[PDB]
Ligand binder design. Structure first.
Ligand SMILES: OC[C@H]1O[C@@H](n2cnc3c2N=CNC[C@H]3O)C[C@@H]1O
Ligand SMILES: [Zn+2]
Length: 359
């Protein structure tokens, strides 16, 4: 046996969630064999870990643990994706050296294991990690790959972890072209390519994305998240120009039947991040989060944590929110995790292994 007795499809009907306290519900969420596709490793940490980094490098000697969390992180939320990014830029204070990056990666993988994630596609931005202390992106990648490997080996491969590379916008020394080049140079370690930060129309980088995609690295980019944009052009470009297999967030697809139809017919999956959307004010509330209408419309969706570090949450919190506020069932969650598995960028023989073991 292993620490977590994962739920089987047959057992789901015997579990009455309505009887359970929040504490007892989280024991059930933990036992869901989760496939997570959208989580930023470089912003994936616990409160305790973050504060330890701040103390290690004596960054905020005049602030208490709690003041440090309020100063740097996004647990209470904010106004926008713009405000989220400026706060992420502050968090880059911890990227002091390659030792802390390895430790970050190690703890990130281990916590996902503890939470009951069986398939983990992590993503990180080389330029985002490098800029604050002018680090070497080759050495950053080395530290990350090493940290993941060491923990995965310790855990006897009971969690399967893959990496995506993020080109991004909205921080100093950001470079999409260079990020794409780095991704292809390290194609053996990267299973996909993403764009994050500020949400922009990626039509203007058609050539860079064509080149990455056509080289055999599938695309999943952030689009249809930011509700402050005056139209849905970013989604049309993501789908029709970038030819993405998956969309980060994509919650604004719900505002257009045309996009709903296109996404369904192209077998595109939306990587929904419930808590993230609410905290960035991209959903008005969890009660009115678009995932419910998207799910009912027949669009493929999966549940993701996005940034455990920024929000001081974990993947099981997102499951809790969908159950409590939007009446999602264990059967829904199993279905969505199976979609996530089907749409994952991991090697298919690994995916077949995970399917036989849990689904
Ligand atoms: O991995 C770090 C990079 O990714 C961005 N990033 C991190 N989390 C998100 C990001 N981007 C867009 N929207 C909210 C959420 O999905 C920040 C940085 O550039
Ligand atoms: Zn994201």
């Amino acid at each position: 046996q292993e620490p977590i007795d994962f739920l089987k499809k047959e057992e789901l009907k015997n579990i009455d969630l309505s009887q359970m306290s929040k504490k007892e519900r989280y024991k059930i969420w933990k036992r869901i064999p989760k496939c997570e596709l959208h989580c930023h490793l470089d912003l994936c940490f616990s409160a305790d870990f973050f504060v330890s980094c701040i103390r290690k490098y004596n960054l905020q000697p005049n602030l208490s643990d709690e003041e440090v969390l309020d100063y740097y992180l996004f647990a209470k939320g904010g106004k926008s994706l713009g405000e989220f990014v400026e706060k992420a830029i502050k968090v880059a204070d911890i990227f002091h050296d390659y030792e802390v990056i390895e430790d970050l990666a190690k703890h990130a993988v281990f916590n996902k294991y503890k939470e009951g994630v069986v398939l983990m596609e992590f993503r990180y931005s080389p330029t985002f990690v490098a800029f604050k202390y002018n680090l070497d992106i080759e050495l950053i990648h080395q530290a990350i790959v090493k940290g993941i490997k060491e923990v995965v080996e310790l855990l006897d491969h009971k969690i399967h972890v893959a990496l995506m590379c993020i080109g991004d916008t909205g921080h100093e020394a950001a470079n999409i072209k260079a990020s794409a080049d780095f991704c292809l140079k390290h194609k053996a370690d990267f299973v996909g390519f993403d764009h994050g930060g500020h949400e922009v129309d990626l039509k203007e980088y058609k050539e860079i994305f064509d080149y990455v995609r056509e080289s055999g690295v599938p695309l999943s980019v952030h689009a249809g998240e930011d509700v402050t944009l005056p139209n849905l052009n970013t989604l049309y470009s993501a789908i029709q120009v970038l030819k993405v297999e998956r969309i980060g967030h994509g919650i604004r697809v719900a505002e257009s039947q045309e996009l709903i139809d296109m996404v369904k017919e192209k077998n595109i999956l939306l990587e929904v991040c419930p808590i993230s959307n609410v905290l960035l004010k991209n959903a008005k509330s969890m009660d009115t989060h678009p995932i419910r209408q998207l799910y009912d419309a027949g669009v493929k969706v999966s549940v993701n944590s996005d940034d455990p570090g920024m929000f001081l949450t974990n993947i099981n919190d997102d499951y809790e929110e969908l159950y409590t506020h939007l009446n999602f069932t264990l059967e829904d969650f199993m279905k969505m995790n199976e979609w996530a598995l089907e749409k994952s960028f991991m090697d298919s023989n690994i995916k077949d292994k995970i399917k036989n073991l849990y689904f």
